[PDB]
From a paper:
In mammals, fatty acid synthase (FASN) contains multiple enzymatic domains to catalyse all chemical reactions needed for de novo fatty acid synthesis. An ACP carries substrates from one enzyme to another, sequentially following the chemical reactions. In metazoans, all essential enzymes are included in a single polypeptide chain and are arranged into two main functional domains, each carrying out a key chemical process and named correspondingly the condensing and modifying domains. The entire cycle of fatty acid synthesis requires that ACP carries the substrate from one enzyme to another repeatedly. Here, using a strategy of tagging and purifying endogenous FASN in HEK293T cells for single-particle cryo-electron microscopy studies, we characterized the structural dynamics of endogenous human FASN.
During the condensing cycle, ACP shuttles its substrates between MAT and KS via a Ppant that is covalently linked to S2156. To capture intermediate conformations of ACP engaged with either KS or MAT, we combined particles of ACP-containing subsets from all three datasets to produce a single consensus composite map and subjected each wing to symmetry expansion followed by focused classification. This analysis produced 11 meaningful classes, which we grouped into 5 functional groups—ACP engaged with KS; ACP engaged with MAT; ACP between KS and MAT; and two different groups with ACP not seen. In the group of ACP engaged with KS (ACP–KS), an ACP density is captured in two positions attached to KS, revealing different levels of engagement. In one position (the grey density), a clear helical density is resolved in ACP interacting with H68 and K70 on the KS domain next to the catalytic cavity. We modelled this density as a Ppant arm attached to S2156. Visualizing Ppant density engaging with the KS catalytic site suggests that this is indeed a relevant snapshot of FASN in the condensing cycle. Mass spectrometry analysis confirms that purified FASN is full length with major post-translation modifications including Ppant modification on S2156, ensuring that FASN contains holo-ACP. Taking two substates, ACP–KS/dynamic MAT and ACP–MAT/dynamic MAT, as examples, the hot area of the ACP–KS/dynamic MAT substate extends from −20° to +60°, whereas that of the ACP–MAT/dynamic MAT substate is confined within −20° to +20°. This difference can be explained by the fact that KS is located closer to the linker and that the catalytic sites of KS and MAT face opposite sides of the condensing domain.
Author numbering:
A (entry chain C): 2155 to 2170
B (entry chain A), C (entry chain B): 1 to 854
The structure:
């Protein structure tokens, strides 16, 4: 979501 | 179909108690945002340490606005501040608030929060009912309408950040349609509980540094601020003062956006700007400044500035100046529009655009800032000319835009009446308020419009403001006089003296007044055919003129008639009239039972009949004896003449009875004042034959007489004959009886009430000492002219000034030519000059009265 | 300068989920106020036990309005309810909300409290940012403008008890000035925390019994209530439905009162009422009902009713009816105006005035109640005629008054087209919503305006409402059909068959439609000069007419042209066209490259040239063999004719080759279908000589031809010749090649996409079985006519109905004559027929989330 894009990139780096 | 103007302004902004302090901080470049624990701690809950807050929050003049002290403690502080600044705005307009007491003027207030309401209702066991009346959001407008007695619409509206300008837009539409004659627009914001700031922090809208870096690369949010602003709007014909004219005003909403509800859309804002100027009929080239919203956010500033450069900077060929007051002040959310409007109007009044703070490098996403089509005001630069646009956008999506045209009225051309001294009256709750108004009037003594509005706002009852004052400006003496006025009504009494008060140069100093000169020339054209003109008796006076008694008679009656005319245009209506011989002749014009021509011809015919026939030279020795002792100590054929007081009685007779009481004047304490007027025995038995020739001439002037009123107290008629047929009308037989009867100036004086204000209408107040011992000690005696005074106009104006200090309302603007209706710009502000009784402290909610998660 | 009407209505009131439930409870005389612990305890803090509260508060269709489920929990419940009733109001107006998506319509909401905002911000450690977006008071209007995409003003205003009617007054002024085309007025009140009720109790405004004894001797206060109401306002030209016309609307304020801020003043209210009707130009005799404020207080009721009887009952000579809905419902503070307006409009729609409750004896301080000049409605009495006044007064002193004139449109005169069957389509979030709409349409099958607005509101995309349905009303079969529509776009394809599908009575049943009859008469006047008229081929048909092939040709092409015209006025534009011989002739009119007259004359000239020359009788036996096996098993001189499918191929030749395959039809599984049309071998080598006489006649009709489009797929031209010069335009050589070439109806069918919707344009769908096995199984085939059907108009309307169930929008209102613009009164309500997906429960604040003094 808009404000949930920070958590989104967090999960992305956790997968990376 | 009506033009709408901004007439008044007042405000309370951070580190800005008055509107002038605001302007100074704005142009001073001071960071009005501070890092102090004035409302909560420094950085609790991770909040930013910096915020803009008001100087004081607990001061309120509760007795003036008629609120009970127990109700004042449980009131919203922002409503108390709004009541005070709402009074200050009306007074800044030059309008007395009592002239709007029954009218259809409306109130529109932009609020967004009520934290005092939820702090005062936390304990349901110790509640009071008054917290509903003083803290409900509708009461922020309804209490204003209740106190000021306004009959128009009374609305409180919330439209997020654009709430204050939306109220201005609705007030504009009410005046424009002809629904309302005037309006009041308000905006209020106060930071009390930190939970709202935590909400704004979690939304991502607050800068961590607490700074509005407007149009800057480093902008990351805004800083929360406080503020209480009010303006007065009116139609053009009611305006004494004009700051600007509202050309157009409108609003729209963003609608649906794919990005979210919060995100700004510059396309709808551009449409609003273009539709406004089109409908207004103004070209986009005519703009020179636009106050942007300018909150300093990362995505809002490029959207707003690109919308501005698409709507405005297409074919312009000139840089457009842009600024934002939130960089100086911070961002009050529902009061941001009126604060920006206050900055714009102060900049227009002082001729200089106030600079922005915290602007170092342009935002790279705004290409109009990099090629010069938009120019940020970062230095003080002068105002050149053109229109100013003000927009404020709420975060819900509400967009509002104003176009206003500044007034460019030049100062007036010099005139010969501008060198004459003027009067300035003042009123206030405290002596310091009156002192402030009088010293600011002294500082600007040559500004005629400023003094006219200051005289207009001073007509307040003594129960509301108990301290009044006055100062004569443009004279050589000067000196403010401040005293406390007793409450209640005091009757006004007119006393005009008789003969023996003439001198060389009667009323010349106040021949410069236009209405006095008009009255003198009216009396002149009246006596013109009778081989006489009193203008050379005024200007060309020497000692060969006033020793004649005809010239003395007309030059007394004309001066008294001119003084009565000046007092009548002043607004003053007497409650009791009592005269003394020729004074009682002028009492006919004072009462309205006579006119100009009959009074002047009656005085001249009295002089002409007296100078026609000849009788043995008479005397007016004055003795220190009472009325009863004088009848038993005079020789037969010698009659007492004037009953001035219990100790002063004037005797009348020939030279040898006059020489008789010279020896008795040596005996004991007896006055030997033997002042005569031409050696003629007025009020005596020697003129029993003077009346039948005189009566014949009079019947041809005061034919068909009018009845005397109950206010006129006769002095030639005894008390028991007051109901007779001779003393009901002011006929020709009434005037000839005045010459042949003694003047009873004592029994008339005991009918004067306790607290009367006595005005002496004479070219020289020689009866002032008689009236002091003859009247009750609770009376005030005011002279109007003084013999051999260098500037008798200053003496007259001081008498009007101390008439204001007694309690009688009297506006000295009517004496002089009126000022043109729009005041020129650069006229000094009035709303910083109003001071209140702030000796008490009232309750303000603390941060501990709000839930902290315990 | 524009007339303003009330177009839509919806609401949620105590014990009144829908507007009809409200009306029933109002006329039922039920006490909608209850004594239940639905929000707090029974009598805690000494509060009254009785209050009016909504039935449910935790239901919201979050997916429709596009809010995230985590954002929906932290939303104000009153905003969720306002979103739903705001949709229901627009739908009640008969207006699709998608027609207002870019317009300048405004939103005005009257709120007074935000308790959810302070309940959701009590813990500053577990806060979320979404509570600012869902609970701020400006968002109650801004979220409505965001979802519905409204560009007008979006204002939330608080004016105490008169807040809802003040919003209506401002929306009136926006439409009247021409600023806005439409508007939405809302009013919301929800009782969540008991501290506000304790404040009202300590002020002395709440009745201890919890009853509004309006106009009664025993009145001692009011009862607090809840409510969510919305209405839709519009200009007169946009209105499909009119409840009433707003004649005038205005407001004022009491100003200063000696008694206090709270006390009511009837003199200012009387002035407001008199100024309104004067400015409106209506006489006071023309009123028949006034909805008073009627709160039941001790000092408010005599002031209001004496003001009413001074402004209105001076010279009247008739009793004036008076009522108050607060006696039935209780008093919602900022939503009292729209609730009273809802009661008034429901009473006008049903013809009966709803009675008051709790009225036993008149107040002795109101003398107009004791002599009959004012009459309280305590029994249901019928509506006679005249105007209705609605006033609501806030306790701060704001006064608002409305004058509205009810519409008295009678039901229309009967017409012969009212006996024809109609179509009704519906959409909804659930199958139950579609069932509700279809059964309510079945209940009111004779109401034409009701069905027209129901058909208008049904054009919603399948992503928003995934369940659609239809029902044919006025027929004899009936039966609702409800199914779930797959999301996405589906292409629409037109297939029109060839010859062999005629029968006795072609299209008679749908000759009653006006546009079909107009197309038939246009084709008639086209063939009129050519010694022919197809009207007797329609009406006067027997078995001596259609055995001719000329009459069959024109009676096929005219019926197909009329069907295409009906589909074109329906709003439908085809994506792909593919025909079959004479069907491919009608494909020219389907594509737009032909017109009416050229198509009809081309068909008649084909028939005329065929009937002119004579060739050996031919055959059209059909065999169960593929296209390749038929070429190797025919005798020479015998050609395959029609490639319908992979298993059905029509052979062409004389009688003796036709007799040849009779014996092979016995062998294995071979079809022996030998259906012929006049014994002529179309699509064969016997008409190579038919074309040169025919071509000559054609060049005189389809001179200067137009090019064919890419949507038209040719069936007489092979695939590799599609780019040639013969197959780009629809010339005369294109039509004569159709007769002399075999029809390739298989390779055209493999170009049809996966999810196409196939429409068959034929007087009898004999190609339906061919298209089922010839196309992909993800395609829908819809016939339009059926041979020997008693009512073929019902069969056509069922095809349009299942075209709605596929996903293609098609409004059947265009088929019939339009309904007159104002709907007659007594038309059934639409807003109670809307049902949502309410399977989930959302968070509502409890009484424990508020400070109790602990």
């Amino acid at each position: 979501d808009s404000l949930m894009s920070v958590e989104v990139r967090q999960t992305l780096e956790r997968e990376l | 179909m009506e033009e709408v103007v901004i007439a008044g302004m007042s405000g309370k902004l951070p580190e800005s108690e008055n509107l002038q302090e605001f302007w100074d901080n704005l142009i001073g470049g001071v960071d009005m945002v501070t890092d102090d624990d004035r409302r909560w701690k420094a950085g609790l809950y991770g909040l930013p340490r910096r915020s803009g807050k008001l100087k004081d929050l607990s001061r309120f003049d509760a007795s003036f606005f008629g609120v009970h002290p127990k109700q004042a403690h449980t009131m919203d502080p922002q409503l108390r501040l709004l009541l005070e600044v709402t009074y200050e705005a009306i007074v800044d307009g030059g309008i007395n608030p009592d002239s709007l007491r029954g009218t259809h003027t409306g109130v529109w207030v932009g609020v967004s929060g009520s934290e005092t309401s939820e702090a005062l209702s936390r304990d349901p066991e110790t509640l009071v009912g008054y917290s509903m009346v003083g803290c409900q959001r509708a009461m922020m407008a309804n209490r204003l309408s209740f106190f000021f007695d306004f009959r128009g619409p009374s609305i409180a509206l919330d439209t997020a950040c654009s709430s204050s300008l939306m109220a201005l837009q609705n007030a504009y539409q009410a005046i424009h349609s002809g629904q309302c004659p005037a309006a009041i627009v308000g905006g209020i914001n106060v930071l009390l509980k930190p939970n709202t700031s935590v909400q704004f922090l979690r939304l991502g809208m607050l800068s961590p540094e607490g700074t509005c870096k407007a149009f800057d690369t480093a902008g990351n949010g805004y800083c929360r601020s406080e503020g209480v602003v009010a303006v007065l709007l009116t139609k053009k014909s009611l305006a004494r003062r004009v700051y600007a004219t509202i050309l157009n005003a409108g609003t729209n909403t963003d609608g649906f956006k794919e990005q979210g509800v919060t995100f700004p859309s510059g396309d709808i804002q551009e449409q609003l700007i273009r539709s406004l100027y089109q409908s207004a009929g103004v070209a986009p080239e005519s703009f020179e400044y636009i106050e942007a919203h300018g909150t300093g956010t990362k995505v809002g500033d490029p959207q707003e500035l690109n919308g501005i450069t698409r709507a405005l900077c297409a074919t312009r060929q000139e840089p457009l100046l842009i600024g934002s007051t939130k960089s100086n002040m911070g961002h009050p959310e529902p009061a941001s529009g009126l604060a920006a409007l206050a900055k714009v109007l102060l900049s227009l009044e002082h001729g200089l655009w106030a600079p922005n703070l915290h602007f170092h490098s342009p935002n790279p996403e705004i290409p109009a800032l990099l090629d010069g089509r938009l120019q940020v005001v970062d230095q003080p630069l002068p105002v050149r000319g053109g229109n100013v646009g003000i927009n404020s956008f709420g975060f819900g999506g509400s967009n509002v835009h104003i176009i206003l045209r500044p007034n460019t009225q030049p100062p007036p051309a010099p005139a010969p009446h501008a060198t004459l001294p003027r009067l300035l009256r003042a009123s206030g709750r405290t002596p310091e308020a009156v002192q402030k108004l009088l010293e600011q009037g002294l500082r600007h003594s040559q500004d005629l419009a400023f003094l006219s509005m200051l005289n207009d706002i001073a007509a307040v009852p003594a129960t509301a403001m108990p301290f009044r004052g006055y100062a004569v400006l443009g004279g050589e003496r000067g000196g403010p006089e401040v005293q406390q006025v007793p409450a209640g009504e005091r009757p006004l009494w007119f006393i005009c003296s008789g003969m023996g008060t003439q001198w060389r140069g009667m009323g010349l100093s106040l021949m410069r007044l236009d209405r006095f000169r008009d009255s003198i020339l009216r009396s002149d054209e009246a006596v013109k055919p009778f081989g006489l003109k009193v203008s050379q008796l005024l200007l060309s006076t020497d000692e060969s003129t006033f020793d004649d008694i005809v010239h003395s008679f007309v030059s007394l009656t004309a001066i008294q008639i001119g003084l009565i005319d000046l007092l009548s245009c002043m607004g003053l209506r007497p409650d009791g009239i009592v005269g003394h011989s020729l004074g009682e002749v002028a009492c006919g014009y004072a009462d309205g039972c006579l006119s100009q021509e009959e009074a002047v011809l009656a005085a001249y015919w009295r002089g002409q009949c007296i100078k026609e026939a000849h009788l043995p030279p008479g005397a007016m020795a004055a003795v220190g004896l009472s009325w009863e002792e004088c009848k038993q100590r005079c020789p037969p054929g010698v009659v007492p003449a004037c009953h001035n007081s219990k100790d002063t009685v004037t005797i009348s007779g020939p030279q040898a009875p006059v020489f008789e009481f010279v020896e008795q004047l040596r005996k004991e304490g007896v006055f030997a004042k033997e002042v005569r007027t031409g050696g003629m025995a007025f009020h005596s038995y020697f003129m029993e034959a003077i009346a039948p020739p005189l009566l014949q001439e009079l019947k041809k002037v005061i034919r068909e007489p009018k009845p005397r009123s109950a206010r006129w107290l006769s002095t030639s008629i005894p008390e028991a004959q007051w109901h007779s047929s001779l003393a009901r009308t002011s006929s020709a037989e009434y005037n000839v009886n005045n010459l042949v009867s003694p003047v009873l100036f004592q029994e008339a004086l005991w009918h004067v009430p306790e607290h009367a204000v006595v005005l002496e209408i004479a070219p020289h107040a020689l009866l002032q000492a008689v009236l002091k011992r003859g009247l009750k000690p609770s009376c005030t005696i005011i002279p109007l002219m003084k013999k051999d005074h260098r500037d008798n106009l200053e003496f007259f104006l001081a008498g009007i000034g101390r008439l204001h200090l007694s309690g009688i309302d009297a506006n000295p603007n009517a004496l002089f030519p009126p000022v043109e209706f729009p005041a020129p710009r650069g006229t000094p502000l009035i709303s910083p000059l109003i001071k209140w009784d702030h000796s008490l402290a009232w309750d303000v909610p603390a941060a501990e009265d709000f839930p902290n998660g315990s």
